[PDB]
Amino acid sequence: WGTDVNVAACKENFQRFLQRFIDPEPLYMQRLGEINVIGEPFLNVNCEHIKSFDKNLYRQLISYPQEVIPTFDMAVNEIFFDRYPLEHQIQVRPFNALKTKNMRNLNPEDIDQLITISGMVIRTSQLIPEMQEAFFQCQVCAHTTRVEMDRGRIAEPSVCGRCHTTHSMALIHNRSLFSDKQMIKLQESPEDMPAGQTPHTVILFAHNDLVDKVQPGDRVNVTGIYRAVPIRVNPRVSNVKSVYKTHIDVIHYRKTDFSEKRVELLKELSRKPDIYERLASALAPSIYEHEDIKKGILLQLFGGTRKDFFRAEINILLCGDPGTSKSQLLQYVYNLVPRGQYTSGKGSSAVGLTAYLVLQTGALVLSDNGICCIDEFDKMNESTRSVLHEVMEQQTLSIAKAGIICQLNARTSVLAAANPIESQWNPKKTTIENIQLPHTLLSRFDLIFLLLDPQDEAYDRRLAHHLVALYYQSEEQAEEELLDMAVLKDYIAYAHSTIMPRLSEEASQALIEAYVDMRKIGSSRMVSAYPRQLESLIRLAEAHAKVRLSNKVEAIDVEEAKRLHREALKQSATDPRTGIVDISILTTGMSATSRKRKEELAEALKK
Amino acid sequence: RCSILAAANPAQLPAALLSRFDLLWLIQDRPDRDNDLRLAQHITYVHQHSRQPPSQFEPLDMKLMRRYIAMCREKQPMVPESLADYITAAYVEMRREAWASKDATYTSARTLLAILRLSTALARLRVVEKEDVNEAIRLMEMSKD
DNA sequence: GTGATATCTGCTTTGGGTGGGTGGGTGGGTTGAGGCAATA
DNA sequence: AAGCAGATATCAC
Ligand SMILES: Nc1ncnc2c1ncn2[C@@H]1O[C@H](COP(=O)(O)OP(=O)(O)OP(=O)(O)O)[C@@H](O)[C@H]1O
Ligand SMILES: [Mg+2]
Ligand SMILES: [Zn+2]
Question: Which of A574, A594, A510 is CA-nearest to residue A544?
């Protein structure tokens, strides 16, 4: 072999490295102790440490990884068995903290050398079995033999040892020994790409415990050996092309993006009198002065109680003029939730809402037990509207296509954003006629909010100052906001984990009286409420109880739910002509005054 | 990460698309004798000599214009604290006119960010100063007409 | 003199349209123009 | 040109 590698000297040097190196008790001695405690036989070693201690050992590791790494394994095994008298022997995984190469600059001089590259995973293959030891059985005497694989070639026996028959040994594929392999496609990082060039892609091969350690979408630093392999002209001939193909044999992956103390902090927050407003403020610091919308979105994030007999999910629609902060709110909620999806109602959209050989479930099914953010709600076609109505009413999605008949669970909360059909919101027009959506679909939303653009000058000045301040915000404030967001996420996770509020007797009486009063308002003069709204109240009440980290729904929760529902209706249920109390616009899609006027017109034309 | 320069003939493009443009310029050619006479004199000269009629200042060649454009692009000027109040005063003035016009103008919060973007571009040609904000304001109001 | 085992000989391969659309597109080939059903 | 199937003469024991 053309290598200046003496195995014994390398092993001794590496054992010396483990014994004496100190991180600026040897660090890797502590690592071996932790290995014994945990039981995972993998030792990661930073190549920078090896370089610092020994520049020859580092140089040999980089130049001849295939020869040198096994000697490192031998050294670590010997040392570890001395210090602590395990399913497998420990395996060293040298790695570089930072990439040493760009995917675009890989060269022939790097073949069979240890390199580190950064990238984003796009595809991973299913597991590929590799034969390590073949199993043969004589087709006459049943005598069995085992042959070790040698550089991808197997020495098939020619004569049975026991009975001496020739050409009688058949390979039993499923009695052999196999190991795992996986193909991964790594895409060049957007930052390192030259301007205007398409991303480059590289092939990686992972084996044994490194399979399935990355998923598509991951951003990773990969340390491995650069390989060059010949390509056959066709499968039948032994001719090869003079230009070789390349891949990387993965050696190390680095993914580059409750505690009792944490629970104590969360409970301490939950004890504070104004936890509701604190969480609401933390929800979206950038948006300005949309307090009730933020409170509703917080309650949607917490959700109501899963009774398991009843949708427990809270649906919110934000309709308003263009140039407001609707998309920003949807983005902030999408970032916050763990199982959320951000999508658009337009059909041309990259990510679809509908389920469509591989069965592909849409965003609504993917957001099951989560929140689906739908940005261009008004731009949905009729089929998408039917799908959304089915999801919101039944919490399931039925498919009968290509011989597949099934029902998919979709228990998802919809946060939707809507714009008017005109260039601006029309005060003369109601909500239904401002946004061209069926009233049947609108009646499935618990809360509808209106984000109108004021004509006030003082509002313009205040918003301008807000935006300028944000344009000049400092890094410490941004970090503080990030910490508050993390606290909010942990609080919501804990509440979902351990809190299941239930209705107390006083809450029940409060809800019944609330519904009766809402009905009375209309009954005094029309109808001012319908039973579905009562259900909404219950959900909201439960959500509020969950914010306090309380297992009992109290009267305060009911009062808050009533206030929020009454504010949303006052925002979105107002008839531009006369007043608000009329909810017939939601139930029938036509204003009561409009209905009377149309009746008059029809009667007159009938005259 | 590219800039968009679009050309369209009035009919109906969606408003969601038009509000994203920093400058929306409506080029209208209303016939007028003297201006039409001047335009014709220019065009006939170009056909006659295959170049524009001479002017007091000679236009710069493309080879040389691409050097200054690249050189300017290296600077990264910043907007001071002090201008914050003045830029704000301009924004409300623009907003008030838009509400008074009752036309389909797209003056919104997005407009404020546009003033900064243009102001820094003007400085990169020349730390931003009040003269760059004045030019940015003038260029934009002339666009909304 | 029999059992390998080394040498020699003949077949057909390739994807391709002079090898068919009377083989079949579940054996496998970009680009465009042309009928359908559902569509608006 | 490249490679497998078949035929067959040939060394060795
Ligand atoms: N209430 C507000 N709080 C903070 N920023 C706001 C507010 N209203 C408008 N803005 C500013 O307006 C821009 C928000 O535009 P965004 O894309 O969120 O609008 P949108 O409501 O989704 O509307 P559309 O899609 O119709 O343009 C940002 O500049 C944001 O700073
Ligand atoms: Mg938007
Ligand atoms: Zn045998």
Answer: A510
